[PDB]
């Protein structure tokens, strides 16, 4: 079961995915270049953004959070309990098990049947050479094009400096000459209307990549190495992992920033067969394009199911109006 969700969200006072400071007193958010038409030729502007790697890691955190409560939660990597996104590292041969056992890196079927995070997000063991591509693909989160076009430059990143109080046992504040630590570190906070294009394929969950099908009697028999109930639980956990991602649990510095989050709109498509990924919501005319992407795909012979959040998508399209993301994932988990 493959599901593609893309939409527009509003962020304010967020500082997700900063470029760090390297031990210095200035930490700034990641920025990258985008191209806009601006009715005067395609110009390139630099805007704040959060990398897809961090979004994928937060999806993994949500997945491992919602998989523990499942009775099949023993089949998990012990390192993944503390949200350590390492998989197998570089110089590793035996992977720890949440139960306390050990897993040999080879025999990818064993890896996917015993570790759940490696099943969904893939893994790499270079000591032997085993690879498994991630079944969840995350895209960048850029501010939407029309917002940049209609803001007319006028950068929206504000540098707020908030200190570090160091009260000594004598109630004194000094410098490094006495053994104290007093720095007024500054952090960059931003805002704007961003877009997300989370795409995730779950048809290969529990399916080794060395032999997806068995061909017992010349039939495309899926090669599931785990219990079907376990596969269903894994898919349900992965689908419910979108509950915290679109509720505000994405990004760094949640303790002191906790981005002011609200999903402005989104569209999601789900199917059992392979389908084109929906265009990102960063572009201004994505919605109409997505409508076509739906309208001309159902007639081709795909049983695409479409859910929208306050998105019209015209008419004559079997689209379900979800009141919130929670109702969306509730609809998705029914067809697993």
């Amino acid at each position: 079961m493959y599901v593609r969700i893309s939409g527009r969200i509003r962020l304010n006072a967020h500082s997700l995915n900063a470029q760090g400071g390297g031990g210095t007193n200035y930490i700034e958010i990641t920025k990258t270049k985008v191209t806009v038409r601006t009715e005067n030729g395609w110009t390139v502007v630099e805007v704040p953004a959060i990398t897809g790697n961090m979004l994928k890691h937060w999806h993994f955190v949500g997945f491992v959070d919602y998989f523990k409560t499942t009775p099949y939660g023993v089949n998990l990597t012990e390192r993944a309990l503390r949200y350590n996104g390492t998989r197998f590292g570089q110089g590793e041969t035996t992977a720890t098990k949440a139960n306390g056992a050990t897993v040999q890196l080879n025999d990818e079927a064993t890896i996917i049947k015993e570790l759940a995070d490696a099943d969904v997000h893939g893994f790499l063991a270079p000591k032997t050479g085993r690879r498994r591509v991630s079944l969840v693909k995350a895209s960048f989160i850029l501010p939407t094009e029309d917002f940049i076009k209609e803001v007319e430059g006028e950068r929206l990143i504000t540098a707020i400096k908030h200190n570090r109080v160091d009260v000594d046992e004598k109630g004194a504040i000094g410098s490094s000459k006495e053994g104290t630590a007093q720095m007024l570190f500054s952090r960059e906070y931003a805002t704007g209307l961003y877009g997300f294009s989370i795409v995730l394929d779950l048809g290969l969950v529990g399916i080794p990549q060395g032999l997806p099908v068995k061909f017992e009697e010349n039939q495309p028999r899926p090669n599931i190495v785990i219990d079907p109930n376990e596969r269903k639980a894994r898919i349900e956990s992965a689908l419910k992992a979108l509950i915290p991602m679109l509720s505000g649990y994405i990004g760094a510095n949640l303790a002191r920033s906790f981005p002011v989050f609200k999903v402005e709109e989104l569209v999601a498509i789900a199917s059992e067969g392979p389908i084109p990924a929906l265009v990102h919501g960063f572009y201004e005319d994505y919605i109409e394009a997505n409508r076509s992407i739906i309208k001309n795909a159902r007639a081709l012979g795909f049983n695409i199911e479409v859910f929208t959040y306050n998105v019209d998508l015209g008419e004559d399209i079997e689209a379900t109006k979800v009141s919130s993301v929670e109702e969306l994932v509730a609809n998705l988990v029914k067809m697993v």
Partner: protein
Amino acid sequence: GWIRNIGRYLSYLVDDTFEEYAYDVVDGIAKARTQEELLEGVYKALRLAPKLKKKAESKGCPPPRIPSPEDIEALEEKVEQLSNPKDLRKLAVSLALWAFASWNNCP
């Protein structure tokens, strides 16, 4: 010459001592594309001049070299002929390059 004085003043915002690390103004001045961005970045940089003046005696350092009215009242009309960003980027980078030089701010 009219760039060394303003660069000397700008170097005061990032250096040893003078505990006020403001990389935002330097970044905005250097990365400015249009005239308005450069002007507002320069205004933001000069807004901290009273702070540097106050902090000079607070640490025993010599008083900062506040830019004279002459160089700014020449730089303003020096800006107001640049119709292309190519000739403005060089001016902005020349302005912001001196901020990271080994000046003797507090000898």
